[PDB]
Amino acid sequence: SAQKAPKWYPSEDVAALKKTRKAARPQKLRASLVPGTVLILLAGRFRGKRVVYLKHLEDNTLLISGPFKVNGVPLRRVNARYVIATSTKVSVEGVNVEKFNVEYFAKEKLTKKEKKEANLFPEQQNKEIKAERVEDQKVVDKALIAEIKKTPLLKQYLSASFSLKNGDKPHMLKF
Structure with missing residues (x-):
């Protein structure tokens, strides 16, 4: 009537996915990420801590x-x-x-x-x-x-926040 019906119709069946060769592996960390290392947070509500x-x-x-x-x-x-x-x-x-x-x-x-x-x-x-x-x-x-407590300025260091100042050059600065 309004539109001529198709001679054939596409299957509604969904083909199964092929086996995906992507096995999981352990996360490799940077050499500097060793337990005890003090970290500067760059995101979230604790940014700068x-x-x-x-x-x-x-x-x-x-x-x-x-x-x-x-x-x-x-x-x-x-x-x-x-x-x-x-x-x-x-x-x-x-x-x-x-x-x-x-x-x-x-x-x-x-x-x-x-x-x-x-x-x-x-x-x-x-x-x-x-x-x-x-x-x-x-x-x-x-x-x-x-x-x-073994280092007299360490608690103070950790208490203080981190922020870049005028003239700072992060690509030259060391941590």
């Missing part, structure tokens, strides 16, 4: 901590291409971060409904850090700070 590199995790990110008591940065994950590895180090020989992993830092599957509600009434959000997480931070900080 200095943190101690504690442990590479399963998702290819790095586990870091300010320490929190030292400069406000909590134990958390950070993507390695957003950090500057400095020559300053904090020993992590007495720091046990083996209990921390990707699942530990996984977030709750917030639903769309809940997201909408949060957007509608953000003032009703009452986030709270798990008691465990608080105590975990205390342990990590304790160990790191004990080592930090």
Whole structure:
């Protein structure tokens, strides 16, 4: 009537995908990314903060901590291409971060409904850090700070933020 029907029709079946020869491999880090290395954060709310590199995790990110008591940065994950590895180090020989992993830092599957509600009434959000997480931070900080105290200006260094100044040339500057 309105349009002549086709003599044949394309199949609705979807062809199976071919075997993909792309096996996974471990993340290779830069030579300077060695646990204890103080890192400069280049992204996120903690941009400009200095943190101690504690442990590479399963998702290819790095586990870091300010320490929190030292400069406000909590134990958390950070993507390695957003950090500057400095020559300053904090020993992590007495720091046990083996209990921390990707699942530990996984977030709750917030639903769309809940997201909408949060957007509608953000003032009703009452986030709270798990008691465990608080105590975990205390342990990590304790160990790191004990080592930090060996250098009289190190705690101050970590407390201070990082920012480029007029005349600075990052491609010539060393860390």
